[PDB]
Design an enzyme around this catalytic site. Structure first.
Site, PDB file in Angstrom:
ATOM      1  CB  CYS A 117      -0.943   0.020   1.206  1.00 45.77           C
ATOM      2  SG  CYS A 117      -1.842   1.573   1.321  1.00 45.77           S
ATOM      3  NE  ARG A 120       2.580   0.600   3.502  1.00 44.98           N
ATOM      4  CZ  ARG A 120       3.723  -0.071   3.577  1.00 44.98           C
ATOM      5  NH1 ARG A 120       4.078  -0.629   4.727  1.00 44.98           N
ATOM      6  NH2 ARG A 120       4.500  -0.189   2.503  1.00 44.98           N
ATOM      7  CD1 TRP A 289      -6.864   9.342  -1.634  1.00 45.16           C
ATOM      8  CD2 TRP A 289      -7.839   9.509   0.387  1.00 45.16           C
ATOM      9  NE1 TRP A 289      -5.922   9.837  -0.754  1.00 45.16           N
ATOM     10  CE2 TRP A 289      -6.498   9.952   0.490  1.00 45.16           C
ATOM     11  CE3 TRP A 289      -8.655   9.555   1.524  1.00 45.16           C
ATOM     12  CZ2 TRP A 289      -5.950  10.394   1.694  1.00 45.16           C
ATOM     13  CZ3 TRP A 289      -8.109  10.011   2.725  1.00 45.16           C
ATOM     14  CH2 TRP A 289      -6.774  10.425   2.797  1.00 45.16           C
ATOM     15  CD  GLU A 294      -5.963   2.564  -6.570  1.00 46.47           C
ATOM     16  OE1 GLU A 294      -6.527   1.491  -6.231  1.00 46.47           O
ATOM     17  OE2 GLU A 294      -5.912   3.579  -5.837  1.00 46.47           O
TER      18      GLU A 294
HETATM   19  C1  HEM Z   1      -6.104   6.660   2.246  1.00 45.97           C
HETATM   20  C2  HEM Z   1      -5.851   6.546   0.936  1.00 45.97           C
HETATM   21  C3  HEM Z   1      -5.219   5.270   0.331  1.00 45.97           C
HETATM   22  C4  HEM Z   1      -4.585   5.259  -0.850  1.00 45.97           C
HETATM   23  C5  HEM Z   1      -4.372   6.497  -1.751  1.00 45.97           C
HETATM   24  C6  HEM Z   1      -4.132   3.912  -1.109  1.00 45.97           C
HETATM   25  C7  HEM Z   1      -3.439   3.464  -2.214  1.00 45.97           C
HETATM   26  C8  HEM Z   1      -3.276   2.137  -2.531  1.00 45.97           C
HETATM   27  C9  HEM Z   1      -3.032   1.613  -3.856  1.00 45.97           C
HETATM   28  C10 HEM Z   1      -2.955   2.492  -5.121  1.00 45.97           C
HETATM   29  C11 HEM Z   1      -2.907   0.280  -3.766  1.00 45.97           C
HETATM   30  C12 HEM Z   1      -2.678  -0.705  -4.938  1.00 45.97           C
HETATM   31  C13 HEM Z   1      -4.084  -1.225  -5.279  1.00 45.97           C
HETATM   32  C14 HEM Z   1      -4.080  -2.003  -6.567  1.00 45.97           C
HETATM   33  O1  HEM Z   1      -3.059  -1.976  -7.310  1.00 45.97           O
HETATM   34  O2  HEM Z   1      -5.104  -2.663  -6.872  1.00 45.97           O
HETATM   35  C15 HEM Z   1      -3.073  -0.088  -2.370  1.00 45.97           C
HETATM   36  C16 HEM Z   1      -2.993  -1.350  -1.815  1.00 45.97           C
HETATM   37  C17 HEM Z   1      -3.405  -1.722  -0.533  1.00 45.97           C
HETATM   38  N1  HEM Z   1      -4.023  -0.908   0.401  1.00 45.97           N
HETATM   39 FE1  HEM Z   1      -3.939   1.126   0.356  1.00 45.97          FE
HETATM   40  N2  HEM Z   1      -4.499   3.117  -0.052  1.00 45.97           N
HETATM   41  C18 HEM Z   1      -5.185   3.919   0.855  1.00 45.97           C
HETATM   42  C19 HEM Z   1      -5.760   3.488   2.027  1.00 45.97           C
HETATM   43  C20 HEM Z   1      -5.803   2.219   2.555  1.00 45.97           C
HETATM   44  C21 HEM Z   1      -6.522   1.794   3.751  1.00 45.97           C
HETATM   45  C22 HEM Z   1      -7.419   2.699   4.641  1.00 45.97           C
HETATM   46  C23 HEM Z   1      -6.289   0.484   3.913  1.00 45.97           C
HETATM   47  C24 HEM Z   1      -6.767  -0.467   5.032  1.00 45.97           C
HETATM   48  C25 HEM Z   1      -7.090  -0.051   6.270  1.00 45.97           C
HETATM   49  C26 HEM Z   1      -5.408   0.047   2.849  1.00 45.97           C
HETATM   50  C27 HEM Z   1      -4.929  -1.231   2.676  1.00 45.97           C
HETATM   51  C28 HEM Z   1      -4.285  -1.683   1.527  1.00 45.97           C
HETATM   52  C29 HEM Z   1      -3.804  -3.023   1.289  1.00 45.97           C
HETATM   53  C30 HEM Z   1      -3.882  -4.188   2.307  1.00 45.97           C
HETATM   54  C31 HEM Z   1      -3.264  -3.044   0.053  1.00 45.97           C
HETATM   55  C32 HEM Z   1      -2.580  -4.224  -0.690  1.00 45.97           C
HETATM   56  C33 HEM Z   1      -3.350  -5.540  -0.770  1.00 45.97           C
HETATM   57  C34 HEM Z   1      -2.344  -6.647  -0.998  1.00 45.97           C
HETATM   58  O3  HEM Z   1      -1.588  -6.989  -0.051  1.00 45.97           O
HETATM   59  O4  HEM Z   1      -2.298  -7.187  -2.133  1.00 45.97           O
HETATM   60  N3  HEM Z   1      -5.158   1.127   2.040  1.00 45.97           N
HETATM   61  N4  HEM Z   1      -3.280   1.079  -1.649  1.00 45.97           N
HETATM   62  C1  LIG Z   2      -8.234  -5.018  -9.249  1.00 41.92           C
HETATM   63  C2  LIG Z   2      -8.026  -4.812  -7.765  1.00 41.92           C
HETATM   64  N1  LIG Z   2      -7.159  -5.878  -7.240  1.00 41.92           N
HETATM   65  C3  LIG Z   2      -7.881  -7.161  -7.250  1.00 41.92           C
HETATM   66  C4  LIG Z   2      -6.758  -5.534  -5.866  1.00 41.92           C
HETATM   67  C5  LIG Z   2      -7.988  -5.334  -4.974  1.00 41.92           C
HETATM   68  N2  LIG Z   2      -7.446  -4.613  -3.835  1.00 41.92           N
HETATM   69  C6  LIG Z   2      -6.839  -5.397  -2.763  1.00 41.92           C
HETATM   70  C7  LIG Z   2      -6.709  -4.521  -1.524  1.00 41.92           C
HETATM   71  C8  LIG Z   2      -6.026  -3.191  -1.821  1.00 41.92           C
HETATM   72  C9  LIG Z   2      -6.785  -2.459  -2.898  1.00 41.92           C
HETATM   73  C10 LIG Z   2      -6.792  -1.062  -2.938  1.00 41.92           C
HETATM   74  C11 LIG Z   2      -7.513  -0.386  -3.928  1.00 41.92           C
HETATM   75  N3  LIG Z   2      -7.536   0.971  -4.057  1.00 41.92           N
HETATM   76  C12 LIG Z   2      -7.558   1.866  -3.089  1.00 41.92           C
HETATM   77  N4  LIG Z   2      -7.037   3.088  -3.270  1.00 41.92           N
HETATM   78  C13 LIG Z   2      -8.205   1.479  -1.817  1.00 41.92           C
HETATM   79  C14 LIG Z   2      -9.185   0.554  -1.454  1.00 41.92           C
HETATM   80  C15 LIG Z   2      -9.428   0.574  -0.060  1.00 41.92           C
HETATM   81  C16 LIG Z   2      -8.634   1.471   0.673  1.00 41.92           C
HETATM   82  S1  LIG Z   2      -7.581   2.300  -0.454  1.00 41.92           S
HETATM   83  C17 LIG Z   2      -8.191  -1.125  -4.885  1.00 41.92           C
HETATM   84  C18 LIG Z   2      -8.163  -2.522  -4.850  1.00 41.92           C
HETATM   85  C19 LIG Z   2      -7.461  -3.198  -3.854  1.00 41.92           C
END
Ligand code: HEM
Ligand SMILES: CCN(C)CCN1CCCc2cc(NC(=N)c3cccs3)ccc21
Ligand code: HEM
Ligand SMILES: CCN(C)CCN1CCCc2cc(NC(=N)c3cccs3)ccc21
Ligand SMILES: C[C@H](O)[C@H](O)[C@H]1CNc2nc(N)[nH]c(=O)c2N1
Ligand SMILES: C[C@H](O)[C@H](O)[C@H]1CNc2nc(N)[nH]c(=O)c2N1
Ligand SMILES: [Zn+2]
Lengths: 419, 421
Positions: A117, A120, A289, A294
């Site tokens: 993520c 963070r 957000w 994305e």
């Molecule tokens: C606050 C604004 C946030 C932004 C801008 C952000 C941004 C992102 C992005 C761009 C990704 C990649 C998603 C993808 O490629 O599909 C990601 C992954 C992730 N986000 Fe964040 N995020 C935010 C908040 C959060 C919050 C609130 C949580 C949980 C409490 C969170 C948990 C995660 C997790 C667990 C992943 C990766 C999942 C994995 O391990 O494959 N995010 N985030």
């Molecule tokens: C095609 C999506 N793949 C399957 C990943 C799904 N996923 C796993 C968890 C982290 C994640 C983050 C985003 N985006 C965000 N900004 C957020 C979603 C919730 C808080 S932040 C969108 C998708 C996912």
């Protein structure tokens, strides 16, 4: 030993000591690296491996110890009593219940520990909704509506997580069957093509089979499919005034709005598993957000998603007969300008990949200073466009697994036996 | 370790099965509890000199390579195989080293390329011209070999991949080394006011050349001299004949002003500071060359902040709004620079590959290697191009990274270890 990570643009070196705390495996060995594998067995949580009294107390003790260390009260009277309280509880019920303070701490640190993520820097600003008293899918729907309303906040998005009851025996799971709370349907067409979002074709068919009447359009918000206490899931329609959407337009190309593109403002992941102190929360939708790429890069331009590059490049009158004209790269940038411009014009929170990766580098520096490290997965952190002109491309990262954590889990329709 | 490992492509759903990882010979840097996949130089991708290989360490390394070679020519267990094994063992006993046959040298070099997990160009691996320079004794002789390599590989713009191999390390005090990082690279000059003229990446090596007696023209694109070390002696300076250095002036098909930026680049990328390891032998001077993928120049060389760093000037000439990052002015200029680089190389008929074509070919290569060899080690962090990552097929391709021998390895900079005579 201490491990050093260097930024090759700024020459900053950071020293990682925090990795010494991790016990979960990564999937790599000394002889093979699995850093690009999306789901090794070490990032997923099956309903097979739900713990027992045996395995549960050490995991619980580990978490209570780190919580009381975090509040600078390690070994205190309150600490000793809590360990004894939890031990008795696991002994006589095979599980235990987190205190509210512990639940909040564990949810924030699961985010803080999410190596994939980039967002963070925000980790300690998270609204935690305790839904552990829920018993029915109607109750789940109510909690989810409140979450959506709170997190959307008329476009001034606020990070939030709603936590439903933990797993007991694995036959009474709470699950959100949707992969996100808000997503668009996809439909297989007679001629073989796909209408809407191809990623959601299977889940759409399950909703239709369960009685959902599909509008059969390009951007139909899916219903919620909610499973409480292992029962059959039930369909619900999110009230539309709660679903904030943005029509995509371009600041320069007046024709862009005629493409008919839209997206929803609130990304809310609803299919992961939250693990805290050995306890498994199989329904824990969380929302933040968007980073612009994305939507603009992956949702719109993946060949297996909406796949709009050809249509856009044609409206741009680009020469599309040779790859080396980079017509795809030109269209890709214009699409991502439109997404950012449209959210910003509608005052819906969004972050561009330059600002987000800059914030992530600052976050890393914060974490190495106060925590001794930051687990980070370069493969996921670097944005899917313009990689090396963002500062994370040049940042060495160490990836390791800390708990509390978010994990993947099997799709419920592959494990659920119905009525 | 499990016998079969599966990788998935998440775009196409194609699943491949890797068994080749079972032959992995040395470490990656990762452990079961940490992944170092984004570390640029883990100590396991490098080779330090002075220690050299001992007699006891050398036999099994040599036997493993000789077995691999005779397996590849479908003569495993043959009379020739067993006789070659006996000959090598006796050489190692009497001389503490051995010499590769010409056929084995060629096989080893091609397979070091085939095994290079960070190279997206490996569909070409079996088409490598190998120049055997193991008879070289002086820096002047090294200069001759290098000139012939450059002329052959350049081939008037129809570039041909090639490698020139100088004598192997003996005791570590007689190393052959090319002190240049590439055979053709541009100088960089630190100015008293803190700015840099030319290529900032090359400032340290430029200062070494000047200390050795090079008279620098002090321009933006000055080809550096060769600094060549034979048999452990002090290195010597040579100028590459400019007629041997093919260069491309960069222009844009639409923007007539782009040529007024005065940009150019050289046609032949020729890495000269790596170490080639074959059968436990260490070739510390082994310059190799191919052709460019356009993003190497247009994204990294031109747009890295620590390199030529031209995004701002290009964005100004494009009349872009440069006040907010969310206008994506950097991304827009980055595309146009890379259009210019590909257009200029193609217009001048100098071989170049765009990142769409190169990654598509690599996926086909990877699939073929899985089917016919049991696997293909690949480093996703390096294989995915530095722009437009997810619109190329490799972004969606799971990869396994592991180290096979023969291999190319990094080595310390020679000025850090050289004992001046
Ligand atoms: C606050 C604004 C946030 C932004 C801008 C952000 C941004 C992102 C992005 C761009 C990704 C990649 C998603 C993808 O490629 O599909 C990601 C992954 C992730 N986000 Fe964040 N995020 C935010 C908040 C959060 C919050 C609130 C949580 C949980 C409490 C969170 C948990 C995660 C997790 C667990 C992943 C990766 C999942 C994995 O391990 O494959 N995010 N985030
Ligand atoms: C095609 C999506 N793949 C399957 C990943 C799904 N996923 C796993 C968890 C982290 C994640 C983050 C985003 N985006 C965000 N900004 C957020 C979603 C919730 C808080 S932040 C969108 C998708 C996912
Ligand atoms: C034929 C055309 C070739 C193309 C298009 C190509 C492409 C590339 C590219 C783009 C990189 C990344 C470079 C960087 O980011 O700095 C790379 C790395 C590499 N190339 Fe190839 N290459 C080609 C030929 C060769 C040849 C002939 C050899 C050796 C005989 C070779 C060996 C390597 C190695 C060892 C690396 C990675 C170095 C490391 O481990 O860090 N390549 N290649
Ligand atoms: C700034 C340069 N960094 C430090 C890496 C240098 N290097 C390491 C070896 C692989 C490599 C490949 C290229 N390009 C090519 N197409 C080739 C060069 C030779 C054959 S193909 C250019 C540079 C490098
Ligand atoms: C194969 C590879 O692991 C896979 O395509 C990854 C690459 N990087 C990613 N990075 C992010 N942020 N999100 C993704 O879905 C992916 N996909
Ligand atoms: C820190 C990170 O490993 C580093 O910036 C890498 C990323 N991927 C790369 N990929 C290629 N092809 N070349 C590089 O120099 C790098 N640099
Ligand atoms: Zn790894």
């Amino acid at each position: 030993r201490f491990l050093k990570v260097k930024n090759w643009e700024t020459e900053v070196v950071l020293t990682d000591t925090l990795h010494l705390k991790s016990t979960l495996e990564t999937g790599c060995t000394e002889y093979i690296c699995m850093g690009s594998i999306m789901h090794p067995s070490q990032h997923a949580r099956r309903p097979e491996d739900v713990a027992t009294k045996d395995q549960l107390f050490p995991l619980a003790k580990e978490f209570i110890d780190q919580y009381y260390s975090s509040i600078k009260r390690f070994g205190s009277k309150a600490h000793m009593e809590r360990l004894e309280e939890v031990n008795k509880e696991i002994d006589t019920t095979s599980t235990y219940q987190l205190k509210d303070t512990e639940l909040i701490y564990g949810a924030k640190h699961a985010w803080r520990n999410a190596s994939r993520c980039v967002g963070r820097i925000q980790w300690s600003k998270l609204q935690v909704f305790d839904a552990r008293d829920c018993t029915t899918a109607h109750g789940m729907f109510n909690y989810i509506c409140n979450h959506v309303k709170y997190a959307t906040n008329k476009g001034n998005l606020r990070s939030a997580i709603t936590i439903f009851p933990q797993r007991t025996d694995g036959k009474h799971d709470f699950r959100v069957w949707n992969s996100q709370l808000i997503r668009y349907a996809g439909y297989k067409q007679p001629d073989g093509s796909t209408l809407g979002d191809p990623a959601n074709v299977q889940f759409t068919e399950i909703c239709i089979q369960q009685g959902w009447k599909p509008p059969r359009g390009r951007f139909d918000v899916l219903p919620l499919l909610l499973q409480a206490n292992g029962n059959d899931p039930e369909l619900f329609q999110i009230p539309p005034e709660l679903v904030l959407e943005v029509p995509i337009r371009h600041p320069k190309f007046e024709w862009f709005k005629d493409l008919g593109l839209k997206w929803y403002g609130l990304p809310a992941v609803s299919n992961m598993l939250l693990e805290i102190g050995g306890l498994e929360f199989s329904a824990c939708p969380f929302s933040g957000w968007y980073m612009g790429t994305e939507i603009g890069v992956r949702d719109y331009c993946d060949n297996s998603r909406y796949n709009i590059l050809e249509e856009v490049a044609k409206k741009m009158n680009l020469d599309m007969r040779k790859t080396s004209s980079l017509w795809k790269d030109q269209a890709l940038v214009e699409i991502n300008i439109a997404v950012l411009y449209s959210f910003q014009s509608d005052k819906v929170t969004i972050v561009d990949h330059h600002s987000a990766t800059e914030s992530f580098i600052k976050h890393m520096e914060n974490e190495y200073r106060c925590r001794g490290g930051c687990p980070a997965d370069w493969v996921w952190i670097v944005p899917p466009m313009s990689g090396s002109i963002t500062p994370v491309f040049h940042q060495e990262m160490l990836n390791y697994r800390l708990t509390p954590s978010f994990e993947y889990q099997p799709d419920p329709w592959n494990t659920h036996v119905w009525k």
